[PDB]
Design a protein around this ligand. Structure first.
Ligand SMILES: [Zn+2]
Ligand SMILES: [Zn+2]
Ligand SMILES: [Zn+2]
Lengths: 73, 48, 114, 164
């Protein structure tokens, strides 16, 4: 409903400005926790195990592969 | 058999991850252990 | 038996064990947040279910017409109007229990005679 | 003899744990040893059923419910009979016993199944026995141009016939 919305801000002098809003964007945080990757993900989700390892991501992090973007920086 | 609650205590002996092994084990316990009676016979009734 | 999600990232904490102090560490798998659980109970099955007979009590049942009406009294308000209906949990082995709800006290009560 | 002395140790422990702490310690350990010999009078460390009966009696002493069994064994309940009881279902305690018979009665009721009973009349006679205890049914089988079938079922002997 980006069309039906319309903006009204009080300014410093008390001016009430009149903006017809055009579009809305929704933002989600991403890779805050060192996400895994596609190929080893496929070997994980393939039906080779009765259950995948419970602490598999923690074990991969202890091995050191697939660090966070903040860690790479 | 004289208690007011009937419990079976069981643990795996071992010479991580034990949750899903126990799940699979108890699934097998529930399914496949025959107790008495011949298979392919279900609830049996008796008439007069 | 309920699920506790990681507060830092909305994913349910998983059971994992302290190797040395022997405690229930509900750890997040998404992030590294960890949490100590309260009871050694983790998994729970309920091979036999017998619940659901009073389902869907909305605040305005009396607005429907098709519910019948009777003359028993609500043993909170004693108003002579009430609404009754069959048990909601439609299995082949449920009962003929009638659940009486009164509009005045907005209160439910049954008629079991055990 | 290790099993002998272990059963003796357990028995001395559970009778010393009784509410009636018996000053007749030698008499109650005599009760313990005579229960040991009459217990091993079954097998004497030859079969695991000896251990099973040991579990039965040991946990019956422990249970609480019931506690009064400790005083009753301390002041009676001659144990050579209690080798040969195998009567755990009829002891410790009576309310659980009553629960057991009502459970068994309900199970026996639920075992025997459907008993539909064939409502009768008295107008026709049997095709074979020739008596009037006749029971029927209605439905129509063939095409629409004709009425029902008028099924018959005798009950004096169980005969079946039909009328058009
Ligand atoms: Zn987390
Ligand atoms: Zn009321
Ligand atoms: Zn006949």
């Amino acid at each position: 409903n980006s069309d039906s919305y319309v903006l009204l801000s009080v300014e410093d002098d008390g001016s009430f400005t009149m903006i017809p809003a055009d579009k809305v964007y929704k933002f989600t945080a991403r890779n805050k926790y060192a996400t895994l990757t596609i190929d080893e993900a496929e070997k994980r989700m393939d039906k080779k195990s009765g259950e995948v390892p419970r602490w598999l991501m923690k074990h991969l992090d202890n091995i050191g592969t697939t660090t966070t973007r903040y860690d790479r920086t | 058999d004289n208690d007011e609650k009937l419990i079976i205590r069981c643990r795996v002996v071992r010479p991580a991850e034990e949750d899903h092994m126990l799940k699979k084990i108890e699934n097998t316990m529930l399914e496949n252990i025959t107790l008495r009676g011949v298979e392919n016979i279900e609830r049996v009734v008796m008439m007069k | 038996t309920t699920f506790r999600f990681c507060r830092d990232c909305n994913n349910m904490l998983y059971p994992r064990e302290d190797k040395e102090n022997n405690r229930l560490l509900f750890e997040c798998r998404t992030c590294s947040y960890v949490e100590e659980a309260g009871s050694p109970l983790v998994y729970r099955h309920e091979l036999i279910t017998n619940i659901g007979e009073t389902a869907g009590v909305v605040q305005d049942i009396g607005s429907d017409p098709t519910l019948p009406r009777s003359d028993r009294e609500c043993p909170k308000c004693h108003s002579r109007e009430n609404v009754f209906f069959q048990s909601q949990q439609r299995r082949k082995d449920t009962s003929m229990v009638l659940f009486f709800v009164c509009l005045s006290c907005s209160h439910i009560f049954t008629s079991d005679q055990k | 003899h290790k099993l002998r002395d272990q059963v003796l140790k357990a028995l001395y422990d559970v009778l010393a744990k009784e509410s009636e702490h018996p000053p007749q310690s030698i008499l109650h350990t005599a009760k313990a040893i005579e229960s040991e010999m009459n217990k091993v009078n079954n097998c004497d460390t030859n079969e695991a059923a000896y251990k099973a009966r040991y579990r039965i009696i040991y946990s019956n002493v422990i249970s609480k419910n019931n506690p009064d069994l400790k005083h009753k064994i301390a002041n009676g309940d001659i144990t050579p009979e209690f080798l040969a009881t195998c009567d755990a279902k009829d002891l410790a305690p009576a309310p659980l016993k009553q629960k057991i018979e009502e459970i068994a009665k309900q199970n026996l009721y639920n075992a025997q199944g459907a008993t539909i009973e064939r409502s009768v009349t008295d107008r026709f006679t049997c095709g074979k026995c020739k008596e009037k205890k006749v029971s029927y049914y209605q439905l129509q089988t063939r095409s629409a141009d004709e009425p029902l079938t008028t099924f018959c079922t005798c009950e004096a002997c169980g005969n079946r016939w039909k009328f058009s």
